[PDB]
Design a binder for this molecule. Structure first.
Ligand SMILES: NS(=O)(=O)c1ccc(NC(=O)CSC(=O)N2CCCc3cc(Cl)cc(Cl)c32)c(Cl)c1
Lengths: 405, 558
């Protein structure tokens, strides 16, 4: 198959990313996987004259003993962005988030039978490190479209299309969207029929080699910021209620505090109850009334990155906000749980990403409330997706935490 | 010396760049003669080849005499070619740590004779290695050669040689899975668990295999004997340890003696537990010249002394047995200093180490402990490919309290409490609730960006009040000050309300030590207290007594 030519974004070249250390079991698992792909021609060893590097990891994927290989092409993707996005870009259906059911299907086996443009292969180098640096890393590059590289589905686009043409023709009202190695398939069918349509579609893929897990978007409604109801209001409680109320506007067009505010004047004991003026209750309720409403005036801007913040809330709970411009939330929610802090954070991160994929067709840059080294040493222990979002590390403002409680 | 027949590694210059052409400076006749003698020998041996003046490339040649001796050495200055050669893959990304080597029954060291010359250079590349021995004065075209093997000091040599050595070993390895060979520069470390018998045999088979590829090596009675010194260590049949360390007897210390000392101690600390260095380091900050003498602080002295004590008499580390566990223990040593040992069998250490780093400005023992655990955890994966079971000086309960309530996500692999004081603990808890019948202080601070003068003070709710002035501060400073007052004038129980998310943040984290003197005082207060409750309100929103302490510290400042 004559290959399509792939070039970097002018004036910059290949990834040179360092390989995190791996434990013995993951290294072994990677040696097997890699000996096999080589025998099958998917990848070939390279020599010292290839200076590039992309990190590689081993994961499991939900309910599976089989180790599976995961290449981190985050860097490569940035460096070829112009190719996969605005040259062979894949349109993203606004309809998808609407469907009652979306099944997500791994379809990355497709890629290994399309050869990779010979002049690009070197940019896909990776290394299998060894313990205690006893031996030099085993070094490889790809001969075929690699999983996890945003180039693969861009290139495989038209084949995907031929494969899906029959099934599509026969099901005008099912939406199929591809993103990296995955297929998103959403319908409004009863769930038995849905699952049945997905089986049917598995058979099509099955005729070209390719070989589900279930979302329900149309029911992802708001995580409205909540104020307390309660008979009896301490100086402290009100203090807190206006802190929260105060912060709430800035994003919430026309939140009010005046009335509420008056209640506190002079310098009283904190533990002193106080009555209420029922016009203060008027605010409260409208505020509340508002606090449950889509932000007025905020809109996805396709040309800007998506950002996600996550706060730890104890008792297995985590809150999060997606936005492009601070305090202009496109979306907010929570994630809730033998599960430690890192394990859960990793789960929330995945869940949010995949929501973000369904809605916008791009993944958010994450701000993680955790220390780099911990995250880096632990995340693959629980990671199950075949992609990897970008992330930073941060310290939660103390207040953000409760203003989202 | 043979020139390995092995496949060549293709090499390129950097895109949009051409080979070098730096002019050859004129040499003295003795220099000129020495080079002619050196080159024709190399030429005879195949290492170089003469070329015409059609080739347009050139790299300076020089010739130096001998540190002491009476031979000549030829220097080729590959800077220019080096700046034009592609990048290669990093040679070796880390070096084994001795504590990670498995014990072998028998081990022997081979080294390759003339590593670089034994291996060929991509043909289409040689032309760029052109050099010119000039004639006597300008006259005459010089003599012109180019390389056929890896040149000394060219950018690609380390990578291709080692890449070559791998290619060449691969099979032998294959048909010898139970023999480990370690490649370092032009040394080979070869160990197995065969009785000396076909260890030597097996060695011989290795040698032949090497010689078959144009690589020659010593033979029995030629090979180093253990301990093999290496990378700073000493390797023995049953143990390893750092190479001899000597702390000089010295009346006066210059910056430079202390820098060196600190370096030997650090190195020493991979196997000598308890080595300390803080006091010594303290001396170095804000430094003067290398030649400057520094008077040894008294702590620095006790520190130096306790260090000579530790070094008094040898300590060694054991090698690694993959069929047993890894236990790591950590002790708090003090002023942000942590110490650790890793072993498999109670008290026979594989290695030791320390962790001090100040991570942040304000911090507490519990945060430090778990930072040390992270750092030790990463190190284990590198060295042994698994994490150790931890033994820590902190109750399960304390840990559970802290992790559970802290904003940031945390984790720690398998551990167990071990009772070795000083134990790790939180030195105070903030309340979750306002304290009934304890005075509320509403504190506040303000600073003038111009004058840098600031006021700080408070107003309680039993009508008490106070305002102090400060002369070269900042808002952050006035707000800690204000909280520090409210803590000075309130006795055992108090509710405090600030509008400084900044101070709040710091204090909610239960710092138990800081770089800020002020923050420390705040800490001794918090520890003296008996029930402190701290709470935040947004400033400049006419609110509680906040609005009053505001106007109070604003009058004058802004
Ligand atoms: N030949 S011997 O006197 O019996 C003898 C046996 C074992 C040892 N040491 C060991 O068993 C552990 S170290 C070892 O075998 N190897 C081979 C594996 C990697 C490696 C790397 C380095 Cl840097 C040094 C050595 Cl000495 C090694 C020594 Cl120093 C000497």
């Amino acid at each position: 198959i004559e290959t399509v030519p792939v070039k970097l974004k002018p004036g910059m070249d290949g990834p040179k990313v360092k390989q995190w250390p791996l434990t013995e079991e993951k290294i072994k698992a990677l040696v097997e996987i890699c000996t096999e792909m080589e025998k099958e021609g998917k990848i070939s060893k390279i020599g010292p004259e290839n200076p590039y590097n992309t990190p590689v990891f081993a994961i499991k994927k939900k309910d599976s003993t089989k180790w599976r290989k995961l290449v981190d092409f985050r860097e490569l993707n940035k460096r070829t962005q112009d190719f996969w996005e605005v040259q062979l870009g894949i349109p993203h259906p606004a309809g998808l988030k609407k469907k009652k059911s979306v099944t997500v299907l791994d379809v990355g086996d497709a890629y290994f039978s399309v050869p990779l443009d010979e002049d690009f292969r070197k940019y896909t180098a990776f290394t299998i490190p060894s313990i205690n640096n006893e031996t030099p890393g085993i070094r490889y590059q790809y001969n075929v479209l690699p999983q996890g590289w945003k180039g693969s589905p861009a290139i495989f686009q038209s084949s995907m299309t031929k494969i899906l043409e029959p099934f599509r023709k026969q099901n005008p009202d099912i939406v199929i969207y591809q993103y990296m190695d995955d297929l998103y398939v959403g319908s409004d069918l009863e769930i038995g029929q849905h699952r049945t349509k997905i089986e049917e579609l598995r058979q099509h893929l099955l005729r070209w080699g390719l070989t589900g897990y279930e979302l329900h978007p149309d029911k992802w409604t708001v995580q409205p910021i909540v104020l307390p109801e309660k008979d009896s209001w301490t100086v402290n409680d009100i203090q807190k209620l206006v802190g929260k109320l105060n912060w709430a506007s800035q994003i919430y067009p026309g939140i009010k505090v005046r009335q509420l505010c008056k209640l506190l004047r002079g310098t009283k004991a904190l533990t002193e109850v106080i009555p209420l003026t029922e016009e203060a209750e008027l605010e409260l309720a409208e505020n509340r009334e508002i606090l449950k409403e889509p932000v007025h005036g905020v809109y996805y801007d396709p040309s800007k990155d998506l950002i996600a913040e996550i706060q730890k809330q104890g008792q297995g709970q985590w809150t999060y906000q997606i936005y492009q411009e601070p305090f202009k939330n496109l979306k907010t929610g929570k994630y809730a749980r033998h599960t430690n802090d890192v394990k859960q954070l990793t789960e929330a991160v995945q869940k949010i990403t995949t929501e973000s994929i369904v809605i916008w067709g791009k993944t958010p840059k994450f701000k993680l409330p955790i220390q780099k080294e911990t995250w880096e040493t632990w995340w693959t222990e629980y990671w199950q997706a075949t992609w990897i979002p970008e992330w930073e590390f941060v310290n939660t403002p103390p207040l953000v935490k409760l203003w989202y409680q | 010396s043979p020139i390995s027949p092995i496949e060549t590694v293709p090499v390129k210059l950097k895109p949009g760049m051409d080979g070098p052409k730096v002019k050859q400076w004129p040499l003295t006749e003795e220099k000129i003669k020495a080079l002619v003698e050196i080159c024709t020998e190399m030429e005879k041996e195949g290492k170089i080849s003469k070329i015409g003046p059609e080739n347009p490339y050139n790299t300076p040649v020089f010739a130096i005499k001998k540190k002491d001796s009476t031979k000549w050495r030829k220097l080729v200055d590959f800077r220019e070619l080096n700046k034009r050669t592609q990048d290669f893959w990093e040679v070796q990304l880390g070096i084994p740590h001795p504590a990670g080597l498995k014990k072998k029954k028998s081990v022997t060291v081979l080294d390759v004779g003339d590593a670089y010359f034994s291996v060929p250079l991509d043909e289409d590349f040689r032309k760029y290695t052109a050099f010119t021995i000039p004639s006597i004065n300008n006259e005459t075209p010089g003599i012109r050669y180019q390389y056929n093997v890896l040149p000394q000091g060219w950018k690609g040599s380390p990578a291709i040689f080692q890449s070559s050595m791998t290619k060449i070993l691969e099979p032998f390895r294959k048909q010898n899975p139970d023999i480990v060979i370690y490649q370092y520069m032009d040394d080979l470390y070869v160990g197995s668990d065969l009785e000396i018998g076909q260890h030597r045999t097996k060695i011989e088979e290795l040698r032949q295999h090497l010689l078959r590829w144009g690589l020659t090596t010593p033979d029995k009675k030629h090979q180093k004997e253990p301990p093999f010194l290496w990378m700073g260590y000493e390797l023995h049949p049953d143990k390893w340890t750092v190479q001899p360390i000597v702390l000089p007897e010295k009346d006066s210390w210059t910056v430079n003696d202390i820098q060196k000392l600190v370096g030997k101690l650090n190195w020493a600390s991979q196997i000598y537990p308890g080595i300390k260095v803080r006091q010594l380091c303290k001396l170095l900050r804000g430094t003067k010249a290398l030649t400057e003498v520094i008077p040894l602080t008294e702590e620095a002295e006790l520190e130096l002394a306790e260090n000579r004590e530790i070094l008094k008499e040898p300590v060694h580390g054991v090698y690694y047995d993959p069929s047993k566990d890894l236990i790591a223990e950590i002790q708090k040593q003090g002023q942000g200093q942590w110490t650790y040992q890793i072993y498999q069998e109670p008290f026979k250490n594989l290695k030791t180490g320390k962790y001090a780093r100040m991570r942040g400005a304000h911090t507490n023992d519990v945060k430090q402990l778990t930072e040390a655990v992270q750092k030790i955890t990463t190190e284990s994966i590198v060295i042994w490919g698994k994490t150790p079971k931890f033994k820590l000086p902190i109750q399960k309960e304390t840990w559970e309290t802290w992790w559970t309530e802290y904003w940031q996500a945390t984790w720690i692999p398998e551990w167990e409490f071990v009772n070795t004081p000083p134990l790790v603990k939180l030195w105070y808890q903030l309340e979750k609730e306002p304290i009934v019948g304890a005075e509320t202080f509403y504190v506040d601070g303000a600073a003038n960006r111009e004058t840098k003068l600031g006021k700080a003070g408070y107003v309680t709710n039993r009508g008490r009040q106070k305002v102090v002035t400060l002369t070269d501060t900042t808002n952050q400073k006035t707000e800690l000050q204000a909280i520090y007052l409210a803590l000075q004038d309130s006795g055992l129980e108090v509710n405090i309300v600030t509008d400084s998310q900044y101070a709040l943040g710091i204090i909610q984290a239960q710092p138990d030590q800081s770089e800020s003197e002020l923050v420390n005082q705040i800490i001794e207060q918090l520890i003296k207290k008996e029930k402190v409750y701290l709470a935040w309100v947004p400033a400049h929103k006419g609110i509680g007594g906040n609005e009053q302490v505001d106007k109070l510290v604003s009058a004058g400042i802004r």
